Amino acid sequence: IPFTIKLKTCLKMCIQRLRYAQEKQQAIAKQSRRQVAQLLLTNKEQKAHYRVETLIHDDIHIELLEILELYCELLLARVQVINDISTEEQLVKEHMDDGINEAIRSLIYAILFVDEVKELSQLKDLMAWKINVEFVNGVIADHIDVPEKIIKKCSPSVPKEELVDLYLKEIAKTYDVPYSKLENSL
């Protein structure tokens, strides 16, 4: 019932869900790499390219999940301090050092981009009550104080052909794809 207890419960669940999502998505990414190799072996260059573009985004998303997990752990260890935060001014001026400002803003901003972890929405609800609605809207609508790294991993730019080629070459090494098959995809 108490705010501190509801927050602790929320953060713990977010950590478990984020860890599980990482595990699952990493395993799937591995399968995707095998499938790209199979596309290369069968001369399906166009499809292999499309699959790599998706894989690139999948890997970036996994990195996002890893960072969010760390932010959750940070907040979990400082839960008692967050209990003494009632305004955004306090958050930005008194909690920029302990990394709380950055951590909470990043998790709220991530809700829209990580629907696989529903509990993140609970953090928004909790902070909208603890601080105010203005704070949460500033994060979502205007990404105020949200780290550039988080904004980029939530919305990565188009993969350049150089990176796609690099992925193809690394997948070819992993799966011993014949030279001719990989070259035809570059």
- CATH number of the domain within which 66 lies: 1.20.1260.60
Specify whether the CB–CB gap between 172 and 182 falls below 8 A: yes
Provide the residue type at 81 as one letter: V
What was the resolution (in A) of this experimentally determined structure?
1.7
Specify whether the CB–CB gap between 108 and 123 falls below 8 A: yes
Q: Terminus-to-terminus CA distance in the chain, angstroms?
A: 58
What would the two tokens of residue 73 be? 């752990």
Q: Extract long-range pairs of 126-133: CB within 8 Å, 24+ residues apart.
A: 126/3, 126/6, 126/7, 126/10, 129/3, 130/3, 130/82, 130/85, 130/86, 131/85, 131/86, 131/87, 131/88, 131/91, 132/87, 132/88
Kind and range of the H or E element at 147?
A: none
Q: How far is the C-alpha of 153 from the C-alpha of 60, rounded, in Å?
A: 6
Q: How far is the C-alpha of 151 from the C-alpha of 72, rounded, in Å?
A: 17
What would the two tokens of residue 42 be? 């069968």
Phi, psi of 115 (to 5 degrees): -70, -10
Counted domains in the chain: 1
Domain residue limits at 149: 1-186
Residue written as token pair 């090494």: 173
